[PDB]
Write a protein that binds this ligand. Structure first.
Ligand code: HEM
Length: 153
């Protein structure tokens, strides 16, 4: 399974493709948003904006991009337990920016494709796989947390 090697690989590749903090975060955020405008909606953060250029290269956007980029770092690293202070994020989302269904799947997917494309020319099939699979893992964890000791019912 996934294992050490796999994990490392994914992690590194990610890290490499990512490298560009600001850009990285912003791009991801924008896509997600335009991808799943549901995102736009949830965002009370920014919404005066809602167009091509606006998302393309927006102040706030970029700002969030970094935070986004940065955070994931941990989750994947632990290369055993992205549970750094991942709980924190989880709680956060639970309360405000909930893990709205497919939302995360989308995020994950988009991020995946984005990266590979950006700083290839890995795509290394095996690599692509983990990457996506990795996001999957993350997602599963967060939700379990949420439902079972976050709110749930
Ligand atoms: C891997 C995915 C995500 C990571 C690691 C993440 C992380 C962060 C972080 C570290 C914060 C700073 C405050 C807090 O914590 O909450 C933030 C805030 C926030 N995120 Fe996320 N985020 C992700 C996904 C999402 C998604 C998918 C959305 C909505 C679909 C979302 C909506 C928010 C909102 C609304 C805030 C606060 C808005 C504001 O700041 O103003 N986030 N997120």
């Amino acid at each position: 399974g996934l294992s050490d090697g796999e994990w490392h690989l994914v992690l590194n590749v990610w890290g490499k493709v990512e490298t560009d903090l600001a850009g990285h975060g912003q791009e991801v955020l924008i896509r997600l948003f335009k991808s799943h405008p549901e995102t736009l909606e949830k965002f009370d953060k920014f919404k005066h904006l809602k167009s091509e250029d606006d998302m393309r290269r927006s102040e706030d956007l970029r700002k969030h991009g970094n935070t986004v980029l940065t955070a994931l770092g941990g989750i994947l690293k632990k290369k055993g337990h992205h549970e750094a202070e991942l709980k924190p994020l989880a709680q956060s989302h639970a309360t405000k920016h909930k893990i709205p269904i497919k939302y995360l799947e989308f995020i994950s997917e988009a991020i995946i494709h984005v990266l590979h494309s950006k700083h290839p020319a890995e795509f290394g099939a095996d690599a692509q796989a983990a990457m996506k699979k990795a996001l999957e893992l993350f997602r599963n964890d967060i939700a379990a947390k949420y439902k079972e000791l976050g709110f749930h019912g």
